């Protein structure tokens, strides 16, 4: 029913280079400030899904150097991705997170022994998240999972704020989506009501993880080409949350009684993860990548002149601290100064592409129509993607066949 | 012989050690304490026939529109500057000009307060048409965090109200949202 | 996502930490406090046509001869049983 793409497509001996030049993202690492609903400084963090929608030149109307090979009848031209390059330029740095109002009341390890200060309140606490190093390339945007509060419970329950059902919501991973965490990839804006169980960056958003199961389980494999993953975490401190337990522990396991007791502690225990050491040797970027054979039936074919590259990197997530003076004084005064958190994130996207052709037969037309008809009216023989927000890059009028003028071209001519 | 470099600062706005627990209190006029600190471990060699450059963050042009302000966030801009002898390597605090943008002269060790650390830009060693600035480069850099603390002083960009619930006694004066 | 879980006990026999210093010797009435932890890092796959048998140390048969006891040490036995779902990792 479904056949590999290389059975019908044809690879030519034509290679072009594209470069995104300098890409910069500067903004506050925790929340997007806006004065009179005008976001001057948006959300910019090293803990952010970077989804780049690359638009491509039409190979059919492009100034092809050898138009003799091309035939307007029964032959169309598409771009095929060959090599990729993600140019990080910022130095190494671990991001810092936290929240001033969090439920950090007992230190179970008893080195600190916080002892749950009196009355229901909060306290300031901060930590770092895990080392996450992920990159994805594809002709379709990635799909990732997260659990959340979906449909209500079975039958007709009567309750007031009990445990909701858990549903595996699978959503397209767009720019503005929050990375996985050691606290679980939930919809904390809705599922969590305190807005105080996690640091400020993830309390009002929806963390989600790429569900590789459905990702690879696609019949056509349009949603992936190849994935690179490195993850590192280890729990550095153990603690509990306050509040009451709606699912109490049975008495059959715990013996209670006597003074200084008969009130059980919280059965809710979580941790603070840490990434430990970063290194340049463990880096997966600033190095050429070659697409020998994709796992799915899509050997780098960019249908519809659209490309999707998503990266998350924590090695370049260092948080910048700024200070300024309102006034000045003879002595050091706390009132004269204002403090700001600014984050930067630098990107280069460098690509080498190979020209691809196709011969139109009746079964070929039927297959290419069944898998996607939108491209079929594109070649002219309501995209839902306009609603979602991505980081768009335009690589039109930037393709160059003079690949020897670029370092990626040199590395490409090094091997074949 | 191999040896770890050490720096520090006697009067730094080390507000509160925050990791295991926090102590949110009203700050005084001065709360600076002596703090010792090491840097990220870095090995780097660059060679060529042209002097290598480096990126560093700084204050760019004046603020856009026609603004009147006293202590706002300045326009933060990348400046490409050629590396000379005497410059300091980037540490974990970011490749930027502390002498201009860090007003206290007190938020970092003294070795990097009045100076500027800048990290070399491999991207302009690559994207240059000739590559005269670089023949071949070696780097090996390792780093990991050991403590967490907040910063004293006012927060010029306060936290949004819809994300944080506050009330009752000991509050309506927010804690330090700056975390380093 | 790759993540580590936390267990613990609200009332565990955590008398005193002994790592660098120790408190007074004899306990009081009840010194049994809130403490949590995480377990060892495990990865294991077994594959076959017949289900695996695994062992644990348990109170086997009573002591030899005819001893009279009151909370004495029970004998140790390497008891073998088939691993079914619901059992939990060492």
């Amino acid at each position: 029913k479904v056949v590999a793409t290389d059975a019908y497509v044809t690879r030519t001996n034509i290679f072009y280079h594209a470069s995104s030049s300098r890409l910069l993202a500067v903004g506050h690492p925790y929340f997007s400030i806006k004065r009179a609903n005008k976001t001057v400084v948006p959300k910019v963090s090293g803990y952010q899904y970077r989804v780049f929608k690359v638009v491509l030149p039409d190979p059919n109307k492009f100034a092809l150097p050898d138009s003799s090979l091309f035939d307007p009848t029964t032959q169309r031209l598409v771009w095929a991705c060959t090599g990729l390059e993600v140019g990080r330029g910022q130095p190494l740095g671990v991001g810092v997170s936290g929240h001033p109002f969090l439920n950090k009341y007992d230190d179970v390890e008893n080195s600190g022994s916080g002892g749950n200060p009196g009355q229901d309140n909060r306290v300031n606490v901060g930590m770092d998240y895990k080392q996450t190093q992920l990159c994805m390339v594809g002709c379709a945007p990635p799909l990732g999972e997260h659990w959340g509060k979906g449909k209500q419970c079975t039958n007709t329950p009567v309750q007031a704020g009990d445990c909701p059902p858990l549903e595996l919501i699978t959503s397209v991973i767009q720019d503005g989506d929050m990375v996985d965490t050691g606290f679980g990839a939930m919809n904390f804006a809705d599922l969590q009501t305190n807005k105080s169980d996690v640091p400020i960056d993830i309390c009002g958003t929806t963390c989600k993880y790429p569900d590789y199961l459905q990702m690879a389980a696609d019949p056509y494999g349009d949603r992936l080409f190849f994935f690179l993953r490195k993850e590192q975490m280890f729990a550095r401190h153990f603690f509990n949350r306050a509040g009451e337990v709606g699912e109490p522990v049975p008495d059959t396991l715990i013996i209670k009684g006597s003074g200084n007791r008969t009130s059980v502690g919280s059965s809710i225990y979580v941790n603070t993860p840490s990434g430990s050491l970063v290194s340049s040797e463990a880096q997966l970027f600033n190095k050429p990548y070659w697409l020998q054979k994709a796992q799915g039936h899509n050997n780098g074919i960019c249908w519809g002149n659209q490309l999707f590259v998503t990266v998350v990197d924590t090695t370049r997530s260092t948080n910048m601290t700024l200070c300024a003076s309102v006034t000045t004084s003879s002595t050091y005064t706390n009132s004269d100064y204002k403090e700001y958190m600014r984050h930067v994130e630098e990107y280069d996207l460098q690509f080498i592409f190979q020209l691809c052709s196709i011969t139109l037969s009746a079964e070929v037309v039927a297959y290419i129509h069944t898998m996607n008809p939108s491209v079929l009216e594109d070649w002219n023989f309501p995209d839902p993607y306009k609603n979602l927000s991505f980081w768009e890059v335009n690589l039109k009028e930037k393709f160059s066949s003079e690949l020897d003028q670029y370092p990626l071209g040199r590395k490409f001519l090094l091997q074949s | 012989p191999l040896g770890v470099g050490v720096s520090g600062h006697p009067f730094l706005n080390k507000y509160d050690d925050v990791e295991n627990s926090g102590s949110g209190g009203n700050p005084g006029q001065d709360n600076r304490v002596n703090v010792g600190m090491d840097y990220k471990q870095t090995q780097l060699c660059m060679v060529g026939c042209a002097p290598p450059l480096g990126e560093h963050w700084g204050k760019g042009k004046q603020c856009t529109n026609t603004p009147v302000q006293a202590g706002d966030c300045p326009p933060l801009e990348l400046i490409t500057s050629v590396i000379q002898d005497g410059d300091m390597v980037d540490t974990g605090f970011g490749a930027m000009n502390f002498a201009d943008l860090q007003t206290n002269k007190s938020d970092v060790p003294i070795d990097i307060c009045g100076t500027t650390c800048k990290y070399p830009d491999y991207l302009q060693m690559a994207a240059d048409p000739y590559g005269d600035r670089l023949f071949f480069f070696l780097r090996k850099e390792q780093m990991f965090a050991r403590h967490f603390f907040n910063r004293a002083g006012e927060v010029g960009e306060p936290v949004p109200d819809t994300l944080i619930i506050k009330g009752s006694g000991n509050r309506t004066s927010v804690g330090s949202s700056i975390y380093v | 996502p790759l993540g580590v879980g936390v267990s613990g006990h609200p009332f565990l026999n955590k008398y005193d930490d002994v790592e660098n210093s120790g408190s007074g010797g004899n306990p009081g009435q009840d010194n049994r406090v809130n403490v949590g932890m995480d377990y060892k890092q495990t990865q294991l796959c077994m594959v076959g046509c017949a289900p695996p048998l695994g062992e644990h140390w348990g109170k086997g048969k009573q002591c030899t001869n005819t001893p009279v006891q009151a909370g004495d040490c029970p004998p140790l036995e390497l008891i073998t049983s088939v691993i079914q779902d619901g059992d939990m990792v060492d």
Partner: antibody, heavy 120, light 107 residues
Framework: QVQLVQSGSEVKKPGASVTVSCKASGYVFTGQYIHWVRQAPGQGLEWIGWITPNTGGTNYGQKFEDRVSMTRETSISTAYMELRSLRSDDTAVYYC?????????????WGQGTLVTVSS | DIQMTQSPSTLSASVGDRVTITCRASQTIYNWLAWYQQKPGKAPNILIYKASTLQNGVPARFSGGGSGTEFTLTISGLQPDDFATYYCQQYNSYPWTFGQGTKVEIK
């Protein structure tokens, strides 16, 4: 044993400043919350404020947030509290006291108290 | 500020009697309460906390209870050393506040 020792009783003129110190020993001094309260003859207990040696983070009551300034030092681990604009009604005994919230415990310690008398 | 009223302000009783002292809170406190007794010239110490929990080293004749704003303390059997001034303090919110006090003295 955790020992907390306050300064001796003092008599001062109105409008002046007083300084009350109390040295603590026998425990990790930095990680605890030390508190100032005062007891007037014929009236109940009331709370002045609280500081911890970490950060010197102060917090004052709504009543006495203006006339007081209080700090700590870790060399011999002593907390100082000074009062300005001595009103004649402030003649009272003053107590510094610390508390550790345990998992299931509360470790309570008080100073011996210091009498402060103000008159013309 | 959170206020409270202790009733009765003054009570007289003989040895071995059962006596109940109450206090009313201005706002809700739940169980964040403790009780103090002060002997003349000496610093008071904790006897009851958690609104129901005895402190260690203290005899079990001393009992506490209550919820919301209504809180009670009971002595089943008086002793001569127990005759002192009694207060209830919430540690709910800052500022900390104490009652007017309750003095007990032998009949």
């Amino acid at each position: 044993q955790v020992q907390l020792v306050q300064s001796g009783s003092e008599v001062k003129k109105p409008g002046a400043s007083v300084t009350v110190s109390c040295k603590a020993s026998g425990y990790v001094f930095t990680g605890q919350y030390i508190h100032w309260v005062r007891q007037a003859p014929g009236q109940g207990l009331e709370w002045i404020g609280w500081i911890t040696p970490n950060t010197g983070g102060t917090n004052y009551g709504q009543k006495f947030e203006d006339r007081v300034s209080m700090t700590r030092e870790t060399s011999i681990s002593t907390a100082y509290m000074e009062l300005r604009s001595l009103r004649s009604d402030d003649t009272a005994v003053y107590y510094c006291l610390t508390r550790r919230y345990g998992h299931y415990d509360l470790f309570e310690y008080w100073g011996q108290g210091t009498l402060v008398t103000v008159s013309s | 500020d959170i206020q409270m009223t202790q009733s009765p302000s003054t009570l007289s009783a003989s040895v071995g009697d059962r006596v109940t002292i109450t206090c009313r809170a201005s706002q809700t406190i739940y169980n964040w309460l403790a009780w103090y007794q002060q002997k003349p010239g000496k610093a008071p110490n904790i006897l009851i906390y958690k609104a129901s929990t005895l402190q260690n080293g203290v005899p079990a004749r001393f009992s506490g209870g209550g919820s919301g704003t209504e809180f009670t303390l009971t002595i089943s059997g008086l002793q001569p050393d127990d005759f002192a001034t009694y207060y209830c303090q919430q540690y709910n919110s800052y500022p900390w506040t104490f009652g007017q006090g309750t003095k007990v003295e032998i009949k």
